Amino acid sequence: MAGHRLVLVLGDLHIPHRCNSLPAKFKKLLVPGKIQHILCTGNLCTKESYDYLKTLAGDVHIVRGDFDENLNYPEQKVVTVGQFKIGLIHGHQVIPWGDMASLALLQRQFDVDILISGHTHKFEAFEHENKFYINPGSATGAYNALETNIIPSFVLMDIQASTVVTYVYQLIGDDVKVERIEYKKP
Amino acid sequence: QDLMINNPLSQDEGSLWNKFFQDK
């Protein structure tokens, strides 16, 4: 397992106004000393949650959600991890939410292999036009302005060579379900 | 293929990732 890069992807926590904490079964998995980078879609919404992320990994990347208190977070970011250029945006900018053509234009504009967005509180992990799209969902299962019964989720990317293995963690009541999706750069 | 065991955050004894982190 040496030479892998593990990247946590999460957001739409909405602590403390909608939720008080990540779920206990998620905190049991999210332990220090494993994850190298964190890419957060935003909506923390306060420093308490940022400080929590810093306990998991030193390298924490956040973009500005519509409800974040911290107006210094950037609107969007592009990072390179391994062979992959990765875009990050919270996604309230996309109307209607999750709109494929909108996201595909961002992919082009950012010039990224993988585009990460949030806002919908619905996980996504799929390939379109040989690019990869991720949405980690809401790690706390916070409601959104359209939806009340949200499954908590987060994502972990395992990046090695020209492959990313994307793990999706979902809390179904209080049992965890994991899914794996592989993407290989063309 | 049980992804509860086979994922990088697995806390399962049998997990290869778990084994990897144990070595420190």
Author numbering:
A (entry chain A): -3 to 182
B (entry chain B): 134 to 157
Give the text the authors published on this PDB structure.
Retromer is evolutionarily conserved across all eukaryotes and mediates cellular trafficking from endosomes to the trans-Golgi network (TGN) or to the plasma membrane. Retromer is composed of two subcomplexes, a cargo selection complex (CSC), consisting of subunits VPS35, VPS29 and VPS26, and an SNX (sorting nexin) module that binds to and remodels membranes. Similar to other classes of coats, retromer is recruited to membranes in part by the small GTPase, Rab7, which binds to VPS35 in the CSC subcomplex. TBC1d5 is implicated in interacting with CSC and in regulating its endosomal localization by prompting hydrolysis of GTP on Rab7.
To understand how VPS29 interacts with TBC1d5 in more detail, we determined a 1.5 Å crystal structure of the complex of full-length human VPS29 and the Ins1 peptide (residues 132–158 and a C-terminal His6 tag). In the complex with Ins1, the structure of VPS29 is very similar to previously reported structures of isolated VPS29 (root mean squared deviation=1.2 Å for 170 aa) and VPS29 bound to VPS35 (root mean squared deviation=0.7 Å for 182 aa). In all three structures, VPS29 adopts a phophoesterase fold, with a central β-sandwich flanked by two α-helices (α1 and α2) on one side and a third (α3) on the opposite side. The second patch is formed by multiple conserved residues including L2, L25, V27, L152 and Y165, which form a surface-exposed hydrophobic cavity. Ins1 binds in a surface groove on VPS29 that centres around this cavity, positioning TBC1d5 and VPS35 on opposite surfaces of VPS29. The Ins1 peptide can be divided into three distinct regions based on secondary structure: the N-terminal part (residues 134–137) forms an unstructured coil, the middle region (aa 138–148) makes multiple sharp turns on the VPS29 surface and the C-terminal segment (residues 148–157) forms 1.5 turns of α-helix. Recognition of Ins1 by VPS29 is predominately achieved through hydrophobic interactions. The side chain of L142 inserts into a deep and narrow cavity formed by L2, L25, V27, I31, L152 and Y165 of VPS29. Immediately preceding L142, P141 makes van der Waals contacts with L152, Y163 and Y165 of VPS29, and also helps to make a sharp turn, to allow L142 to contact the hydrophobic residues from VPS29. In addition, from the C-terminal region of Ins1, W150, F154 and F156 of TBC1d5 form a hydrophobic cluster on one face of the helix and pack against L2 of VPS29.
